[PDB]
Design a binder for this molecule. Sequence first.
Ligand SMILES: Cc1nn(C)c(C(=O)Nc2ccn3cc(-c4ccccc4)nc3n2)c1Cl
Ligand SMILES: [Mg+2]
Ligand SMILES: [Zn+2]
Ligand SMILES: [Zn+2]
Length: 315
Amino acid sequence: GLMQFTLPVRLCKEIELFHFDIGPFENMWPGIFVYMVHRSCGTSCFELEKLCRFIMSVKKNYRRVPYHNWKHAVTVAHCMYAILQNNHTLFTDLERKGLLIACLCHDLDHRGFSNSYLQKFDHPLAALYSTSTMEQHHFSQTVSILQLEGHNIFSTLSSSEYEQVLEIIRKAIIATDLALYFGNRKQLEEMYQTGSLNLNNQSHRDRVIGLMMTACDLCSVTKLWPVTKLTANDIYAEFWAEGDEMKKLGIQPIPMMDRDKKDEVPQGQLGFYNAVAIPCYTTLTQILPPTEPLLKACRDNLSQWEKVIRGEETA
Ligand SMILES: Cc1nn(C)c(C(=O)Nc2ccn3cc(-c4ccccc4)nc3n2)c1Cl
Ligand SMILES: [Mg+2]
Ligand SMILES: [Zn+2]
Ligand SMILES: [Zn+2]
């Protein structure tokens, strides 16, 4: 504990804000992650040497894709850090540990293609895992890395505690399958509006963590507009490449994956904010009131996409 991690003054202050952008210097991202772990968990949560070796193996198993890349992993992890820091009484020792690692690992070995494309392509992973195909692969990749020599960051846990934290990580990574989000948020909403929601109930906790994982995964819609707009180019770079691959299989891609429909992106975004993002951050704010700034930044970006649609802003 005599060797503490420190950030430059601007980063030290701004990393506490939900809308923090981790910057273009990839060599700083491991330091930013260790810093976040030491502050949300404790400097005794992990042996720094094992953690650093784990981080560099995770980085190596992210691919050079426009969006689902190492920078997305650290960005999702930072959103989870901001949630946990502003709700520090609500989560256990194992949960803080497990959720930051789950976020870092949540898209391991992503090739830029959705579960739908893997099913249509008849990819081997689709035979192995019929539902949440990519997400079950991301978890499998996480377990493989945890089992490399010198990479067991959980080595000081009991067998039972180790099993608990791997279960937290598995459920958290599976929760990032957006197909599961619709069901999960509806259940949470009904539970909140009937006053049945109980954070002491493990099945209830699992759902709240699932929604937190969705909120963290979508957190590009909660950045300052210039970040949100530039990130949309990377997201669509992947969608359109998948749409190209759907056309190569003789299948019409859905409109968001068709690069010929580029002029309808602003209306597509508006659609996504109304059906997915706003409801997500609304339900999260109901359950965890200090996450309000995610909802506020989402509503501000919704207003920016509307300004694009009315031609008061270009994209
Ligand atoms: C962050 C983030 N993480 N995800 C998974 C998303 C996303 O899923 N975004 C979406 C959804 C639905 N869309 C529809 C259209 C669209 C485009 C052109 C013509 C017609 C429709 N664009 C869309 N984008 C965003 Cl954002
Ligand atoms: Mg994704
Ligand atoms: Zn994913
Ligand atoms: Zn993701």
